[model samples]
Structures are given as C-alpha cells and as structure tokens.
Target: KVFERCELARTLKRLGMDGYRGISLANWMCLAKWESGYNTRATNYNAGDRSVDYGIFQINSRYWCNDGKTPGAVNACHLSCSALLQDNIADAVACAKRVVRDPQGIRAWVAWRNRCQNRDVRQYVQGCGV
Candidate 1:
C-alpha cells in the first residue's frame, strides 16, 4: 500500500510505535520515505552481496526474510520476503520491532543513517496532528 505521509503517521501511532520501543514517528517516517516511499511492494537488489531489502521497512533478505534463492540467508523472520510486500504490515511491523531491539536500532536502515539522522524531522508530520 502507498501511504500518504500523514496517514502513515496516524497508522504508526495507532500501532503504538510513535514513541514506543524508542522510535520517534519522524524517525520511522523518515525511514519509510527514504527506504520505500511507503510502498509495501518495494524491494531492492544488492549487486555487491546479492542481498535484497524487502517492503516498506526494507528488511534485508540476507538476515531477515528468505526468498528461497537468496543464499546464506537466516530467515530470521521465518517468512518469505514476499510476505512483507503486501498490504498487511503486521508481519513487517513484527520483524521491524525485532530489528530495532538489536544493537543497530534505527541504524538498520541506511536511509535513516544517511538522510534522517541528526535532522529536524519534525516537518515529517508538522501538519498531520500525529
């Protein structure tokens, strides 16, 4: 699903992630925008390691989900990578929570590291009332 910025903010808030688990709404919002532009079907193939980032959260295929063909995969989420590319984000949210619990925190996302880090992301939901 393609989520509007405010709609996503509201949805994340409804899921209790806005400040839950140490994640700011703008933090993940910045992640969604740069990672997949909020597209559930988003995926990117890495030429160097041949890994793939899946869904709006872009969870990695190497360590998170499996496509069956991606070698050396751990399938940490115990689901197919394609499962994350759907309208329902329950699975994705669950996996993302695990990722955050790791030492990486939001650093799991390169977009968050490069674009959203150390910024005034208040503008991400300035008028959304989220």
Candidate 2:
C-alpha cells in the first residue's frame, strides 16, 4: 500500500488538487482495476501492435517514457516513470487527477464503469458520486 499512498500524494502535489483525495483514491482503484487490474507490469495489448503503455495507470511508454518526445512530461506520461523505472505513482496520480478534472475524465470514468456493467449502457449509475 506504500506505492498507492506515495502515488496518491505525488498526484496531489503535481496537480494542486484538493477536496477529493479519498474519492480520488477510490476512483483510482477503480481505474486501475479496469486499466491493469492493479498490475504494475501491465501493458495494453489493445491499443496498438507495440504500444508500451504500462503500470496501474496504463501510461503509454512511447509517449511518457524517457524516450518519448516529452520524456518527463508529467501530464503526458502521468508521471509514472522515475529515472527509467516504471513505478512512479506520483506521475500516474498527477495524470489521473488531470484527467478527472476534465470533461473527458468524467466521461472516461463513466464509460469505464458502464463497461463493467454493460457494454451498451451509456448511462452512468456512478453519477459522479465522487
């Protein structure tokens, strides 16, 4: 759980986020369940043939990793990698918060949850419950 806590704290610091730390934590857990099932080594096989998206946040390595255009671009990478290691929770949280604060984030989370319920159901029962 250290990783989770560290990641959450880092996310809060990077995004200047507030008021929803607990909710954010729950949402993050939900997102991780859908994204990688809490697997740090998870990679997306559905995105592209060789997409390197990794970790609980599923950050696209090609875009966020050190070799990507931005390298340390916190927003793009979700700040998921630190010094080439793939365990930067702070970056992931920052990215997650940014997404949550946006319209897309809300929609994305709704879609994710609805997918868990039914593929065709677009109506979010979560209702921004956070």
Candidate 3:
C-alpha cells in the first residue's frame, strides 16, 4: 500500500518509531519517503552483492532478513524477506528496530544519510499529530 505522508507518520508513531534509538519520527518518515515512498512491498535488488532490500524500511537480505539467496547472509532479524512485504508491517517494524540496535543506528540506511540526516526533517511530521 502507498501510504499518505501524515498517515504513515501516525502509523509509525503507533509502532513506537518516535525517538526510537534516538531517531525521531520525522527521520523515520524521511527514510521511508526516500526508501519506498511508504509502499510496504518495495524491494531493491543489489546486483553488486546479490542482496535485496525489502519493505518500507528497506531492510537488507545480506544482514537482516533472510531471502535465502544473498551470499554469506547472517539473517540477523531471523525472518523471511517475504514478511517485509506484507501490508500489516508488524514484522517490518520489528526488523527495523533490530537494525537500529547496531552501532550505526539509523545510519545503516544510505537514503537516510543522503536525504534525512542533518536536515530539518520536522516537516515530515508537522501537523500529523504524531
């Protein structure tokens, strides 16, 4: 599903995204906007490493979810890549939470570094009542 900006903001809030690992709701919104435009089923294949990024947060098969195809994968999240595509998003959110536990925090997503980091991301959550 393609979620409207504010709708996604509120949804992330309910999923405990606000201030998660010192990352704000606006930052999460910015990441989702750039990564998948809030589309739950979005996937990006990395030809270089044959790893795939899955779902709204673009969690990776190389380290997070297991697609059973990425070479030398670790399956850190212990879930199937297919789970990230579900509209329910509970599994995606859980995996994303695990991702932030790494030392990089939100920096794990390059899109966040390029588009959301060091910016006035407040606009992403403005007027959303999140």
Candidate 4:
C-alpha cells in the first residue's frame, strides 16, 4: 500500500504524529518520504549489517524488532518485523513511537536528518490541512 502524500499526512496526523515527542507531522512526513515513500511493504536489506528495514518508517531489525536473523537484536518494540509490513500501519506507528521514546527522538532516522532537518519541511503537509 503506497499512500498518496496528503493521505499519509492525514493518516499520520490521526495517529498522533502531529506533535509526537516534539516532532511535527511534517517531519514524520519527510522521513516517510525519504525512507520508504509511504509504501507499507517496502523492505531494504542492509548487506553490511545483515539486518533489514521494514515498512513505511523503515524501522530496523537491529534494535527495534525481531526478525529472527538479526544477531544481537534487542527487539525493544517487542513485535515481529513482519508486523511492520502489513497495510495496517498501527503496529508501525506504535513502533515509531517507541523509537522516538529514546533520547534520539526523530533524529534516529538519518534520512530525516539529511533531508528533513533544518529544511523547510512544511511543504510535505502544507496542503493536507493536517
């Protein structure tokens, strides 16, 4: 399920991402744009770490979820990586919340740093009315 830009913004806003942990909805929108382009089934395998990034936010297997193959994984999200792949983003949104609960906040995603951070990210949700 690849979401339209405005659709994703509205959905994320409904999921309480608008002001989650000091991060704005547009910032989350920016992260999703760069990470997985709003595709629910998006998957990226890191050959370097042998871990895969799954779902819209590209949550990783190393420290967030259990994939049964990422050695030394913490599974802090306490859910299977497969859960992030589903069209229903509730699990993914929950894990994304868990990710920001850490000290890093939204900065945990480098894509947000390089692309969304310090930039005018308002365009992501400008017309969405979210």
> Residue 71 in candidate 1 has what lDDT?
81
What are the runs in model 2 whose C-alpha is more than 4 Å off? Answer: 1-24, 47-50, 61-85, 109-111, 115-130
> Candidate 4: global Cα-lDDT?
0.93
Using TM-score as the yardstick, the better of models 1 and 4 is 4
Q: What is the Å distance of residue 24 in model 4 from its true position?
A: 0.6
User: Taking the tens digit of each residue's C-alpha lDDT, what string does model 3 give over 1-130?
Assistant: 8889999888889999888999888899999999998999899988888788998999989888888777788988888999999988888989999989989999988899999888898888889887
For every candidate structure, what is the RMSD over all alpha carbons to the true structure, in angstroms?
1.1, 7.5, 1.0, 0.9
Q: Write the per-residue lDDT of candidate 4 for residues 1-130, one digit (tens) a residue.
A: 9999999898898889888999999899999999998899999999998999999999999999999998899999999999999988999999999999999899989898899989999899888876
Q: How many backbone clashes does candidate 2 have?
A: 2
Q: Highest TM-score: give the candidate number.
A: 4
Candidate 1 structure lDDT: 0.88
- Rank all candidate structures by their lDDT, best first, as comma-separated numbers: 4, 3, 1, 2
For residue 87, what is the lDDT in candidate 2? Answer: 54
Candidate 2 lDDT, 1-130, residue by residue in tens: 2244345434444455434533443444445656665565565544443545556666555545543443334435334344322454555555555555545553455435654433432222134332
Cα lDDT of all candidates, in order? 0.88, 0.48, 0.90, 0.93
Top candidate (lDDT): 4
Candidate 1 displacement at residue 21 in angstroms: 2.9
Candidate 1 weakest ten by summed lDDT: 12-21
Each model's number of backbone clashes? 0, 2, 0, 0
TM-score of 1: 0.94
